[PDB]
Amino acid sequence: MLLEAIAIALTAAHFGAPLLYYWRAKRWLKKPWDVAPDPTYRPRVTVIVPTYNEAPLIEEKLDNIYEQDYPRDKLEVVVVDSASTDGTPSAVRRWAETHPDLALTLVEETERRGKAHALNTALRHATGEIVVITDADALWPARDTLANAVKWLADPTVGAVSCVKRPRDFYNVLRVAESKAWATPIFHGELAAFKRELLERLGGFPTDVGADDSHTATKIAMMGYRAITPPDVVCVEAVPKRGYHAWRIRRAQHLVQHFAKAIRDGKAPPPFKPILHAEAYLHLANPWALPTAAAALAAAAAAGSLPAAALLATGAALALYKPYRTWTTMQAYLIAAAVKNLWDKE
């Protein structure tokens, strides 16, 4: 019967870690911000949207940036296109000469060579003090969304700002709790704003990692600046109708490469290192304890024991209610991402 002992030891550890961390986070949550948004701060802001073959979306995405209340003499846009099959380079022609008051630069590259490459080339054509990366399929819900992000960037100790997303609450609690504590290691491509002096100290975006936003936010946090997601900077998540599981596995893959690379580098500030280590644990270690318990159980169930068999009937019964199946399937995505990571590089 020792397989039941190991099975629910692993299940106790796996489900206990995230709720000990959440409890710790909630503690941090009622502590007030040691930084303040400044509404009269007006830096020059460059919005960079990297695009490869999204001629449908680009029209209204530029429309969404255009309709922001942030003052246009301090706003410019760089649509960076990596040699696209579609007619996007001058889909941005179209729009760009139809909205002339909005300073825009379409820079196009020799070659398609990935997201970070496009961002780096766009970076040295950017003139703003704040660089905001955003995905072409992401739309900002309010006309003051960009201004809300920028107001959080005023304090000299804040190097990076991202949004909280809407369509779990557990996730958003982690985000703004870690942000209050010091920094959060996960940013969102819907709105990722960095101080350009810091980007060019880094310098530019590294090609090694998929989660460019969260890797750059994390490296700004290791350097001693704040990387934060304030609750009033809210984006809505862009979920594609088809290929959903593949997409979620792909973003998990970016997350596990990011955290695997980030824990490798040592000099983390005292407030940040528990944050870094806890979310690196949750992303690289805990997922594994789940399906190992499941296999321990199945083997035991097959070889006679019925308690385990019930343990797994209970597990299926807990799949009916939605917080359990959100959690389980994200652990599944994380395991898929780990194996896909190991075998993608060969």
Looking at residue 136, which CATH number applies to its domain?
3.90.550.10
Q: Hey, how many other C-beta atoms are within 10 angstroms of the C-beta on 4?
A: 17
For this PDB entry, the determination method is: X-ray
Q: Are strands 158-162 and 192-195 parallel, antiparallel or unpaired?
A: antiparallel
Pick the closest to residue 7 from 281, 290, 293, 208 (CA basis): 293
Contact between 54 and 169 under an 8 Å Cβ cutoff? The reply is no
Contact between 209 and 254 under an 8 Å Cβ cutoff? The reply is yes
Sign of the CA dihedral running 145, 177, 255, 274: positive
User: 251 a known binding residue?
Assistant: yes
Q: Based on the number of CB atoms within 10 Å of its own CB, is 232 exposed (0-12), middle (13-18) or buried (19 or more)?
A: middle
Q: How many helices (H) and strands (E) does the chain have?
A: 13, 9
Pick the closest to residue 340 from 325, 276, 332 (CA basis): 332
User: 124 a known binding residue?
Assistant: no
265: Cβ–Cβ under 8 A, 6 or more apart, which residues? 222
- Report d(CA 233, CA 161) in Å as an integer: 9
66: Cβ–Cβ under 8 A, 6 or more apart, which residues? 99, 102
Grouping H, G, I as helix, E, B as strand and the rest as coil, residue 171 is helix
Q: Are strands 103-108 and 75-81 parallel, antiparallel or unpaired?
A: parallel
Pick the closest to residue 262 from 248, 250, 279 (CA basis): 279
Contact between 104 and 97 under an 8 Å Cβ cutoff? The reply is no
User: 101 a known binding residue?
Assistant: no
User: 136 a known binding residue?
Assistant: yes
- Report d(CA 149, CA 233) in Å as an integer: 6
User: 271 a known binding residue?
Assistant: no
- Report d(CA 89, CA 73) in Å as an integer: 24
Domain that holds residue 220: 45-271
User: 52 a known binding residue?
Assistant: yes
User: 137 a known binding residue?
Assistant: yes
User: 302 a known binding residue?
Assistant: no
Sign of the CA dihedral running 255, 258, 263, 266: negative
Provide the CA 121 distance to its chain's centre, in angstroms. Answer: 22
- 42 vs 72, 134, 183, 326, CA distance in Å? 11, 20, 23, 40
- Report d(CA 242, CA 230) in Å as an integer: 31
Q: At what angle do helices 2-29 and 273-284 cross, to 10 degrees?
A: 140
- Report d(CA 186, CA 181) in Å as an integer: 14
- 3 vs 256, 283, 291, 298, 313, CA distance in Å? 29, 25, 13, 10, 17
Contact between 297 and 4 under an 8 Å Cβ cutoff? The reply is yes
Omega prior to 203 cis, within 30 of 0: yes
Pick the closest to residue 68 from 139, 126, 12 (CA basis): 139
DSSP state of 233: S
User: 247 a known binding residue?
Assistant: yes
- Report d(CA 243, CA 249) in Å as an integer: 10
Structure token digits, residue 125 = 């054509």
Contact between 147 and 198 under an 8 Å Cβ cutoff? The reply is no
- Report d(CA 301, CA 313) in Å as an integer: 11
3-state SS of the chain: helix, strand, coil percent to 5? Answer: 55, 10, 35
User: 112 a known binding residue?
Assistant: yes
DSSP state of 32: P
- Report d(CA 24, CA 331) in Å as an integer: 21
* Resolution rounded to one decimal, in angstroms: 2.7
Bridge partners (DSSP) listed for residue 117:
none
Residue 224, phi then psi, degrees to nearest 5: 95, 10
User: 109 a known binding residue?
Assistant: no
- Report d(CA 193, CA 150) in Å as an integer: 8
User: Which amino acid, residue 151?
Assistant: K
DSSP H or E stretch at residue 149: helix 145-152
- Report d(CA 28, CA 183) in Å as an integer: 12
